[PDB]
Design a protein around this ligand. Structure first.
Ligand SMILES: Nc1ccccc1C(=O)O
Ligand SMILES: Nc1ccccc1C(=O)O
Lengths: 345, 343
């Protein structure tokens, strides 16, 4: 017999939930039946108990059951996502990597929205580049077919999440809800590079992806970055065929020099947009290096769907393809093509 | 740094104690109607799971007090006591009557609760529970006991009270009742269901230089009973001894938890009338125990007496108060006072 006092009581007593309790709670939230106080109490208690992968899979699965889908046969089977869950943040890096990956010929389907103020959301940077971010499912699918990239604006695909999003804005603090973005991409891409700023939650997310039919790299810079970093090593949870392979990754093995931490963080939408134009135009430096690193990681994830190429040669190839997509102008050109698509309605 | 919800909640979710003043800021937001329900709830839960400190709880209680209606000046005897728990047959209500009848002024504080609460049981007995400060003061003066109805004394708490009801689960706010009695008694017997929080409560009383016994049944009750041993934090002179308490040491037989079972207001009123009329059994025993503890706390405002003799005198005084008829007579005087208000 599920109820808020029961579920909240179990969480505050530091107990993992019974199977189905997280699903019940999410469905109450998603149907407009949870009070703001109940939504907040749940988010916080779940965060402080430390969610399990089973629990997170329930939350994400319920949320997806309420989302608008893309139309039948419209997402390529091998589409990928490239995104972090936030720190500071790296929307600068994930935005540029996504364009690079798509320019390398891998279909990309991203998901997000506008942030409340000045630390750019994913959507805001694209909007500052002239990309049209709020498109219906049919137009997102056209974008994928004609441009090789699409963007699913969270408020349009997840209308029933509005009660949770309001509570999240009111309380400010990061919660378990911050983890759901990468896991509730309404295009349901089966591969991805997914960054997490916290190693304990990264393992949890990897667990959720492992229970899906997915080929993903969940990544955590050992400096706290929610992307593969160039300032030090990163932890990677490699997910494929329902299993996880956790490893320490060092980009110095591919000849990347060490950068400093104040060189990579994203800023506001305009600052991100300027940085995007510089990198896609060929400006060398630590930002480009991190973009190429994370783009290659997405490409490696994508390869995991079919290739069965081994880890090291897959990396060598993802790096060569990412670098080439920039240096040959393919990424600059793809961004311009994406902007053109939007202007043509 | 300017306090904010993101900052405060983030510190709590990182399992960190707050900076001085952060808890105070949160309560003031709450008390002024400036905190949204979601922020109140997030704070209540986060503080609970982190485990509040005495300093933090003192901040919450002090701000809450600052918004409360006071009793009029010089109307509360310097040596008043409270008898109360933080959350089953209203033992604390019977014990309050016995303590008052033993000559110790008592001021209780609470609210209406299917399980009848203290306040609901007093109304079933004919006591007028919702009186303003001037009349609570007069009751204290003329009867030796008073009751502060929480919604009337803490009107600004209504935003928090609604959130509490919405989420259901116990939180740090459950500690506040004993620490925000608007009559500000300096002594008390205070029951708490949870050992860690009982110790936190003791610390706040210690910081106030109160003379209190904070009691924890080793079987999860927020009262003393004859069911089990209990843990007691003896607070006096800003200092704290933690002690084990076993009622078998004073001759009490061990009772079963279900012989103390409460019911509706009418049933609980009958139980009060039976104890005050001198009926023997485990209810009487539990009442005598809690009243004795309150009396011991009261004694602690002047002297620091030997523990065991304090308890013997406390127990004798509580027993006498029943068996002389003084407790039954005090309830009658209390009812009478309330009935005189109309004219
Ligand atoms: N504000 C949001 C943020 C993310 C996902 C959905 C929403 C929504 O309002 O439906
Ligand atoms: N339940 C309460 C306790 C104290 C103050 C106000 C309220 C209220 O309900 O408005």
């Amino acid at each position: 017999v599920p109820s808020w006092p029961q579920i909240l009581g179990r969480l505050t007593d530091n107990r993992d939930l019974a199977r189905g309790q997280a699903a019940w709670a999410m469905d109450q939230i998603m149907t407009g039946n949870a009070r703001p106080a109940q939504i907040a109490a749940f988010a916080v208690a779940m965060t402080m108990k430390a969610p399990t992968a089973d629990e997170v899979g329930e939350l994400a699965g319920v949320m997806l059951s309420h989302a608008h889908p893309l139309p039948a046969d419209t997402v390529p089977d091998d589409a990928v996502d490239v995104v972090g869950t936030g720190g500071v943040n790296t929307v600068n890096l994930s935005t540029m990597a996504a364009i690079v990956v798509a320019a390398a010929g891998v279909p990309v389907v991203k998901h997000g929205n506008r942030a409340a103020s000045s630390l750019s959301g994913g959507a805001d940077t694209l909007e500052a580049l002239g990309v049209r971010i709020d498109l219906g499912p049919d137009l997102v699918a056209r974008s994928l077919a004609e441009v090789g990239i699409g963007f699913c604006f969270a408020p349009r695909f997840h209308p029933s999440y509005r009660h949770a999003a309001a509570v999240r804005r009111e309380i400010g603090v990061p919660t378990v809800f911050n983890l759901l973005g990468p896991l509730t991409n309404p295009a349901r891409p089966r591969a991805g590079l997914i960054g997490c700023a916290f190693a304990d939650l990264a393992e949890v997310m990897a667990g959720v992806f492992a229970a899906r039919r997915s080929s993903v790299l969940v990544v955590h810079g050992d400096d706290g970055l929610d992307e593969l970093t160039t300032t030090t090593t990163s932890t990677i949870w490699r997910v494929a065929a329902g299993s996880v392979d956790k490893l320490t990754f060092d980009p110095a093995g591919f000849g990347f020099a060490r950068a400093q931490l104040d060189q990579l963080a994203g800023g506001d939408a305009q600052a991100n947009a300027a940085a995007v134009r510089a990198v896609l135009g060929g400006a060398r430096g630590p930002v480009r290096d991190a973009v190429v690193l994370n783009a290659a990681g997405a490409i490696v994830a994508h390869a995991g769907l079919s290739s069965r190429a081994e880890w090291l040669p897959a990396w060598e190839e993802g790096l060569r393809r990412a670098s080439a997509a920039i240096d040959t102008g393919a990424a600059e050109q793809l961004l311009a093509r994406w902007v053109r698509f939007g202007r043509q309605i």
